[PDB]
Design a protein around this ligand. Structure first.
Ligand SMILES: CCCCCCCCCCCCCCCCCC(=O)OC[C@H](COP(=O)([O-])OCC(O)COP(=O)([O-])OC[C@@H](COC(=O)CCCCCCCCCCCCCCCCC)OC(=O)CCCCCCCCCCCCCCCCC)OC(=O)CCCCCCCCCCCCCCCCC
Ligand code: BCL
Ligand SMILES: CC[C@H]1c2cc3[nH]c4c(c3C)C(=O)[C@H](C(=O)OC)c4c3nc(cc4[nH]c(cc(n2)[C@@H]1C)c(C(C)=O)c4C)[C@@H](C)[C@@H]3CCC(=O)OC/C=C(\C)CCC[C@H](C)CCC[C@H](C)CCCC(C)C
Ligand SMILES: CCCCCCCCCCCCCCCCCC(=O)OC[C@H](COP(=O)([O-])OCC[N+](C)(C)C)OC(=O)CCCCCCCCCCCCCCCCC
Ligand SMILES: CCCCCCCCCCCCCCCCCC(=O)OC[C@H](COP(=O)([O-])OCC[N+](C)(C)C)OC(=O)CCCCCCCCCCCCCCCCC
Ligand SMILES: CCCCCCCCCCCCCCCCCC(=O)OC[C@H](COP(=O)([O-])OCC[N+](C)(C)C)OC(=O)CCCCCCCCCCCCCCCCC
Ligand SMILES: COC(C)(C)C/C=C/C(C)=C/C=C/C(C)=C/C=C/C(C)=C/C=C/C=C(C)/C=C/C=C(\C)CC/C=C(/C)CCC=C(C)C
Ligand SMILES: COC(C)(C)C/C=C/C(C)=C/C=C/C(C)=C/C=C/C(C)=C/C=C/C=C(C)/C=C/C=C(\C)CC/C=C(\C)CCC=C(C)C
Ligand SMILES: COC(C)(C)C/C=C/C(C)=C/C=C/C(C)=C/C=C/C(C)=C/C=C/C=C(C)/C=C/C=C(\C)CC/C=C(\C)CCC=C(C)C
Ligand SMILES: COC(C)(C)C/C=C/C(C)=C/C=C/C(C)=C/C=C/C(C)=C/C=C/C=C(C)/C=C/C=C(\C)CC/C=C(\C)CCC=C(C)C
Ligand SMILES: COC(C)(C)C/C=C/C(C)=C/C=C/C(C)=C/C=C/C(C)=C/C=C\C=C(C)\C=C\C=C(/C)CC/C=C(\C)CCC=C(C)C
Ligand SMILES: [Fe+2]
Lengths: 281, 305, 247, 54, 43, 54, 54, 54, 40, 54, 38, 43, 43, 54, 43
């Protein structure tokens, strides 16, 4: 049931809504007010995905797809069999995500730790709402959101990207990709370094943080530190998600053409625009 | 209210020259300058850096690769600095044309210079890998960094060396340019059906998203328990403190299971090496085993027939 | 090999994907068992071994050799709290909170908890103390931030509780770790740097009211701090967030 | 040659020898690849032409 | 000098052996170039 | 010449031998790949065409 | 002139010599590549055309 | 006038020397490239035209 | 920078000697190019 | 002038002078490139036209 | 930099500035004679 | 001299064995090249 | 008074040897340019 | 030649044995795959052709 | 030299057994190549 050290931490407090009501654990899980809300919303969304599979006529989990309303419904309601199930599932998903974040806040303040984790999760919630709520509302139809299918939302990604030609000419998209790649590289390096210090050559003592600093200074001439590497990890992940949200929010709203055509402002700059040579001349 | 994102007080002392387990100290440099800007976020100290035989080999080869691509770019500009600055991101060293196969007879302008640059890059990357291994060995540490780098090298080798050989043509390889290798990526997806329906492509994307997820979770967790000295994880592994227990209990009460101060780093290293490993496999299978990934998906229950 | 199947639709891509599923299941098993080296076996709320322990077996022990002759650590191993817990059950059934019997901040339970870590200071790679007061550190000075020395310290009740006397510095990382605060009675306490907000004219401690500063655990040696003392201080200051909400 | 022997009083011989090996090998490979790139001086192809290999 | 720790005699001897090796390498290269130039001159 | 044995007091034999082994194997593989890539000197297809195996 | 030797009292000879070697090699390679890229002064093609090598 | 020497009191001589050497080389290369790009003053092309190299 | 007045004067004297040598070489080169192929 | 000398009480002189030099050089390069763009005030092209270099 | 030192650095800086401006004006006037936009 | 800890005799013996191995490798390579050149000359 | 630690005599000797090397390199370059200019002038 | 046994004083036998095993297995697999790739020396396909199995 | 802790006799014995294994492996490979060359020569 409990970990060897868990008992002294399970104390009555830290709730946002309610009091001793909902202030208990079910197995390992803590279930506050927002635990109840999360469970209800998640279960309803999953059963509605299953019922949409029933209506669709497929039981292959890779072929199940819940499509948004067609463009002719605009931002209004749609019949359940045609677009309404997607809307109810979207509401359930938003409720589940927000209740999960608030439940994390309750757990954080019961344990006395900072609220870094719910904030970081709120970043991902905002990216999801950008794709499913804000961009469809600005573009004026629920039909611009993506469907709930394992391989059909990839079709949404492909169609949306190829509407504007090659999509990785979008500049905020380039920044987001660079952040994602740097994040994966930093995660690999950090995990490898801590493991290499804690698991040295056979028969040796554990290495110290001095050895980690020394290793990176020998390798690349700089060490960011331990606090530094964790700050950098949080910031790289959040920056990647923020720039992805930005590059999608500006895509069908401010920009309307090929992004490669966007990159021509630099080439057509007056003081080299007509010099005859190279690629663009 | 203090979130521990930026340091509010900065201190400096004597520079830390580093440990001397059995590193050859004659190959180290002096310490560089301290930077306040970097010290706001992490450490201010720059250097010293170790330079050895493999450092020299990697630097020479990487500099030659960079200079070869740069001189080719200067040639494409017509030696005009204005055109060089305007059409930067548009220049590219291209691999030999498809009709040359794997042969080395392609002219300098039509792909021979690409082969020279590729050889220099090959030497630079492999000598840097050896350097990571040897720097780990000198300090008595495990070689985890070398193996993660080996995963990255696997994907790089498949893209540039292994797959072109199996396909029987250097024209399959990636060109050296900013926009040109993006164009190569897009055309690679278009030629082989739809790379979204490559299952190992999907796994690679899953592990890239998972790296972002796990790194955000872990950075946030360590910053949240940094009020108990949770950033000093190497000591929390040896002597568990209230920081490690609070982090474990947060994740246990949230999602029902937790990690340790060392197991989380095992999760981290595997989550990253997996994106690169699965990506290498997925690229290797494209064109050599599957020519049209969308039709493959239709035949394997992923797309509607 | 384009279109070469051994049976059905099974080609090298299908072989690769199924091999990867098997590998991934094995890898997940390995990662979970490696994570199971702390906190197990699972216990009942009365301390006895729980009936249930989980789907994953406990891993084989491994030993760490600690530096500077500090000993060895073998995990998994017999783990005991080695301190009294002043908590009482609020319910006979499991899954309910345990209410503190006395003052939670003095007793060190809940968000005010601490662990019985080693009673020795943390060392650096050369064997010296990791954390030193900046006065005892040689060549250390404040570089680019607001220098907190001499600033008054204000608690969460907007009342002055003391003044900053020194800064305790992590020598290898070259970062400030603690603020040393002199109280009204001429006694000094350590405050975690991550729990204070250094302003233009003051240092503000949101977690702790002015009267509670005297209750911070003290260090038995003015020149060094051990791991156990760090646990007590950090746990006390953090427990102030929940247990000093009024006033 | 004249008094060039004192270069060893400035430079560690090991590092100089390693730099020389790296530099010479890379230069030789580059020159051979350049020769193979030129339609003339590609010894394999002109040998094929001389003996009617292809 | 205190730059590498070699004395004058050590530097002289090391340079003598290095020059022997350099002249051997150069002689081999000269013979190779003579053979290539006879086979296929580039001027 | 006749005094090159003195190089071994300068360089560690272990590092020299491992580097030499790696270098020699890579050079052999490189030259074999170059020979296979040319339509001539690819001994497999030369033998195939000589004995009419395709 | 006569006082230029004093530059060695500001600059470490080792660092200067390394930087000078790298600089000179890169400059020589660049000039050779510029000459090769020009239809005239490409000595390989000039000798190919003179000797009817193609 | 006659007192500009005091600038070496304000700037470290080695840093200034490195920076001005880099600046001088880059400026010279940039001007040479500018001359090479123009059809006129491309001394290689006009030499070729004068002696009928093409 | 830690230089005294005399040290700065001497360093500047040598620097100016080098600068004038470089400038004289550049002037001769420009004269040769202008005679060979004037640009005005 | 009046009291602008007091800025050096606030700013490190090296940073200001370095920024000034970089800004001046960039400005001059940009203006020269602008002049070289238009046929007017392009000294390399008007000299070619005057002496019939084409 | 104190008052007198800053003032002296100021004066030497303006001496340099006026010499540079003089050379620039010489060049501009030479252009105006050689090829005027006015 | 003191770079690797080998004495003069140790260096001489190690170099003798190394040269034996080098000459064996070179002889095998020479025979291989002779066979290839007879089979299919490249000049 | 040297920041590199060299004395005046050491700097003079090092510069003498450096200038010998520089003049040798320049002489070789001059001969090479003379040969190329005779073979194929660029003016 | 008779004294090659001294290689085991400078090389760890275990590391050499592991590396040699890995190297030999990878080499053998690579050669077999190259042979299977070529239309000749694919022993399965040519046994099929020889024994009239379609 | 003994970088590995082996004595002279230990190295000799280990090398003897290693060479026995190497010659067995080489003999098997030679027989295999003879069989393949008789079946389908590549020269
Ligand atoms: C076939 C399918 C099914 C297979 C099996 C299925 C059965 C059930 C599943 C079983 C698998 C469970 C895996 C869990 C293992 C746990 C590993 C671990 O983290 O720590 C334990 C252990 C040591 O832990 P430790 O306590 O930290 O030790 C510290 C030491 O004290 C001191 O430190 P150290 O010096 O000892 O080094 C520490 C390091 C030690 O780790 C290693 O030694 C790794 C060695 C390199 C990998 C081998 C391939 C390299 C290429 C071949 C050339 C060299 C071969 C290796 C040479 C060996 C020399 C020693 O340990 C680590 O923790 C490393 C963490 C990250 C490793 C990342 C490895 C990246 C590999 C890149 C691959 C590049 C080529 C790929 C080609 C395509 C392959 C599909 O490490 C390992 O055992 C590493 C396992 C390596 C697995 C390689 C990946 C295999 C990919 C197959 C994918 C499936 C096939 C899909 C395609 C199929 C096509 C048909
Ligand atoms: C139209 C474009 C196509 C497409 C075409 C491709 C192709 C083609 C490839 C990918 C690949 C990848 N794609 Mg995709 N991709 C598309 C859409 C997506 C989407 C999306 C939301 O739509 C996402 C998230 C991704 C994501 C991903 C990654 C998971 C993966 C690359 C892993 C990696 O880190 O590589 C970056 C890391 C490396 C390349 C390793 C580099 C290692 C070397 C050693 C580094 C050397 C440095 C060098 C010396 C330079 C020195 C610098 C100095 C030292 C400073 N793609 C669509 C369908 N994608 C790759 C893959 O694995 O596919 C299976 C791949 O090859
Ligand atoms: C912002 C940086 C990254 C980030 C951060 C992040 N995510 C987080 C956290 C953090 C810090 C958490 O604390 C939280 C967590 O608990 O993780 C274990 C979470 C989380 N990140 C998750 C996943 C996730 N994160 C992703 C991304 C990212 N998360 C970013 C890259 C992605 C993708 C695709 O990129 C996924 C899939 C979950 C594991 C978890 C949130 C769990 C949760 O919300 O649980 C409540 C809801 C359910 C149990 C299910 C609801 C089901 C719906 C009703 C139906 C939905 C159908 C769906 C739309 C179909 C799509 C096809
Ligand atoms: C991390 C996980 C995400 C990465 C996914 C990328 C790889 C997956 C593709 C594998 C593949 O190639 O498939 C055929 C491959 C090979 O094809 P095959 O023909 O040999 O066999 C499977 C074919 N069908 C489906 C017809 C049986 O087979 C498999 O991989 C089967 C094993 C797992 C299949 C994946 C199912 C995921 C869904 C399970 C539960 C989800 C419910 C939710 C659904 C509703 C969503 C809104
Ligand atoms: C494949 C999954 C492996 C399943 C094992 C498992 O989940 O263990 C659960 C555990 C395993 O047993 P355990 O948790 O009681 O502990 C095992 C005892 N030791 C450590 C001493 C060996 O069982 C339960 O949690 C009971 C849940 C009720 C399930 C009702 C029947 C189904
Ligand atoms: C890697 C990328 C893919 C991400 C999935 C891996 C993480 C989940 C599986 C890890 C196993 C955790 C575990 O112990 O039991 C499962 C746990 C269940 O909790 P648990 O109580 O069984 O975990 C503790 C088990 N003992 C005590 C033996 C260690 O996972 C969950 O909480 C929910 C089910 C999995 C989530 C769905 C996966 C998608
Ligand atoms: C594209 O370019 C192409 C490919 C066309 C052509 C280019 C070619 C050029 C660029 C490549 C040049 C390659 C040259 C440099 C090859 C040089 C080869 C030399 C190094 C051969 C050396 C062989 C050494 C052999 C293997 C020696 C073996 C002897 C060892 C076994 C000695 C160890 C014996 C033990 C007993 C030592 C222990 C001694 C005791 C006392 C401790
Ligand atoms: C694109 O441009 C192209 C490539 C087309 C053309 C451009 C070409 C230009 C840029 C190429 C430049 C080439 C360089 C400059 C040529 C340099 C050659 C070098 C200098 C060769 C030197 C060789 C010296 C070596 C071979 C000698 C080795 C002998 C030693 C190993 C002897 C052993 C040392 C003794 C034992 C030391 C012990 C003594 C003490 C007492 C212990
Ligand atoms: C695109 O626009 C274009 C390119 C067309 C036009 C733009 C042109 C640009 C904008 C114009 C830039 C002009 C620059 C600023 C020209 C300035 C040139 C001067 C500053 C060059 C000065 C060179 C001085 C060097 C050569 C002197 C060297 C002498 C030293 C090496 C002597 C050694 C010093 C030792 C002895 C110090 C001794 C100290 C002891 C301890 C006493
Ligand atoms: C695009 O632009 C193009 C390429 C078209 C044209 C542009 C051209 C311009 C921009 C290029 C400028 C090039 C530079 C400025 C030319 C530099 C030439 C160098 C400076 C020549 C130096 C040669 C130095 C020689 C090789 C050095 C020899 C060194 C000696 C051997 C030193 C030995 C010292 C030891 C032996 C003793 C000293 C220590 C003891 C204890 C006394
Ligand atoms: C100011 O200008 C100067 C000249 C000073 C310098 C300017 C430099 C700038 C302009 C250069 C910029 C270069 C950038 C654009 C590099 C871009 C690189 C791209 C992004 C690379 C992306 C993918 C390439 C990877 C996948 C390549 C892998 C290739 C390896 C696997 C090579 C395999 C080795 C084989 C092919 C060598 C075969 C040759 C024989 C000897 C075996
Ligand atoms: Fe960490």
């Amino acid at each position: 049931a409990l970990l060897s050290f868990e008992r002294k931490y399970r104390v009555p407090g830290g709730t946002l809504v309610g009091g001793n009501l909902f202030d208990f654990w079910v197995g390992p899980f803590y279930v506050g007010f927002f635990g109840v809300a999360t469970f209800f919303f998640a279960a309803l969304g999953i059963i509605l995905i299953a019922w949409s599979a029933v209506l669709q006529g497929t039981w292959n989990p890779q072929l199940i797809s819940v499509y948004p309303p067609a463009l002719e419904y605009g931002l209004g309601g749609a019949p359940l069999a045609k677009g309404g199930l997607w809307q109810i599932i979207t509401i359930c998903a938003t409720g589940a995500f927000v209740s999960w974040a608030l439940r994390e806040v309750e757990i954080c303040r019961k344990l006395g730790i900072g609220y870094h984790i719910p904030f970081a999760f709120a970043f991902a919630i905002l990216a999801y709402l950008t794709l499913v709520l804000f961009r469809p509302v600005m573009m004026g139809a629920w039909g611009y959101a993506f469907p709930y299918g394992i391989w059909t939302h990839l079709d949404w990604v492909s169609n949306t990207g190829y509407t504007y030609g090659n999509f990785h000419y979008n500049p905020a998209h380039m920044i987001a990709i660079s952040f994602f790649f740097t994040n994966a590289l930093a995660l690999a390096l950090h995990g490898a370094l801590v493991l290499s210090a804690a698991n040295p050559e056979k028969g040796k003592e554990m290495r110290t943080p001095d050895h980690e600093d020394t290793f990176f200074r020998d390798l690349v001439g700089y060490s960011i530190g331990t606090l530094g590497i964790h700050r950098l990890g949080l910031l790289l992940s959040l920056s990647a998600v923020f720039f992805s949200a930005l590059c999608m929010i500006i895509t069908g709203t401010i920009w309307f053409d090929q992004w490669v055509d966007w990159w021509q402002w630099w080439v057509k700059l007056p003081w080299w625009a007509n010099i005859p040579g190279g690629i663009n001349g | 209210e203090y979130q521990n994102i930026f340091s509010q007080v900065q201190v400096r002392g004597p520079a830390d020259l580093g440990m001397t387990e059995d590193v050859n100290l004659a190959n180290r440099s002096g310490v560089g300058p301290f930077s306040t800007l970097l010290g706001w976020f992490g450490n201010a100290q720059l250097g010293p850096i170790y330079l050895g035989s493999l450092g020299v080999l990697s630097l020479f080869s990487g500099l030659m690769w960079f200079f070869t691509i740069g001189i080719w770019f200067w040639y494409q500009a017509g030696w005009n600095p204005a055109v060089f600055l305007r059409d930067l991101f548009f220049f590219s060293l291209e691999p030999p044309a498809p009709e040359y196969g794997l042969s080395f007879a392609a002219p300098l302008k039509e792909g021979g210079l690409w082969l020279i640059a590729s050889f220099f890059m090959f030497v630079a990357v492999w000598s840097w890998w050896g350097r990571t291994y040897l720097r780990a060995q000198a300090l008595g540490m495990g070689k985890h960094t070398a193996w993660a780098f080996l995963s990255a090298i696997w994907l790089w080798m498949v893209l540039g060396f292994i797959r072109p050989i199996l396909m029987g043509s250097w024209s399959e390889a990636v060109p050296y340019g900013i926009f040109s290798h993006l164009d190569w990526t897009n055309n690679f997806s278009l030629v082989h059906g739809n790379l979204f329906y490559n299952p190992f492509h999907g796994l690679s994307i899953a592990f890239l998203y998972g790296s972002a997820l796990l790194f955000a979770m872990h950075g946030a967790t360590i910053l949240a328990v940094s009020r108990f000295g949770g950033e000093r994880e190497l000591e929390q592994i040896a002597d568990r403190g209230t920081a490690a227990e609070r982090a474990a209990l947060f994740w246990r009460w949230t999602m029902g299971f937790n990690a340790t101060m060392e197991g989380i780093h095992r999760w981290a290293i595997w989550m990253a090496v997996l994106v690169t490993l699965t990506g290498g496999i997925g690229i290797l299978l494209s064109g050599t085993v599957v020519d049209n990934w969308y039709v493959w998906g239709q035949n394997h229950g992923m797309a509607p027939l | 090999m384009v279109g070469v199947t051994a049976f059905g639709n099974f080609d090298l891509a299908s072989l690769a994907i199924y091999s990867f599923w098997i590998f991934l299941a094995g890898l997940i098993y390995y990662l979970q068992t490696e994570n199971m080296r702390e906190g197990y076996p699972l216990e009942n709320e009365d301390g006895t071994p729980a009936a249930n322990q989980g789907p994953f077996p406990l891993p084989k022990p491994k030993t760490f050799i600690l530096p500077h002759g500090r000993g060895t650590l073998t995990v998994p191993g017999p783990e005991s709290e080695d301190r009294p817990i002043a908590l009482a059950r609020t319910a006979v059934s499991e899954g309910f909170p345990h209410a503190p019997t006395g003052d939670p901040m003095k007793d060190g339970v809940g968000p005010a908890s601490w662990v019985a870590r080693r009673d020795l200071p943390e060392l650096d790679g050369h064997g010296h103390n990791k954390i030193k007061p900046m006065k005892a550190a040689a060549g250390f000075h404040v570089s680019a931030g607001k220098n907190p020395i001499g600033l008054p310290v204000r608690g969460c009740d907007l009342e002055i509780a003391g003044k900053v006397v020194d800064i305790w510095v992590d020598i290898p990382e070259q970062m400030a770790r603690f603020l040393e605060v002199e109280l009204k009675d001429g006694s000094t306490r350590l405050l975690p740097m991550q729990m204070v907000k250094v302003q233009s004219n003051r240092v503000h401690v949101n977690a702790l009211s002015s009267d509670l500063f005297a209750g911070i655990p003290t260090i038995k040696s003015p020149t060094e701090v051990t791991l156990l003392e760090e646990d007590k201080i950090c746990g006390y200051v953090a427990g102030g967030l929940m247990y000093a909400a009024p006033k | 040659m004249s008094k060039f022997y004192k270069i060893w009083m400035i430079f560690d011989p090991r590092r100089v020898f390693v730099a020389q090996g790296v530099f010479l090998f890379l230069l030789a490979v580059m020159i051979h690849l350049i020769l193979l790139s030129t339609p003339s001086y590609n010894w394999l192809e002109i040998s094929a032409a001389k003996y009617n290999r292809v | 000098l205190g730059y590498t720790g070699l004395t004058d005699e050590q530097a002289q001897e090391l340079h003598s052996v290095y020059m022997s090796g350099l002249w051997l390498f150069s002689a081999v290269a000269i013979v190779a170039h003579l053979a290539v130039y006879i086979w296929r001159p580039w001027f």
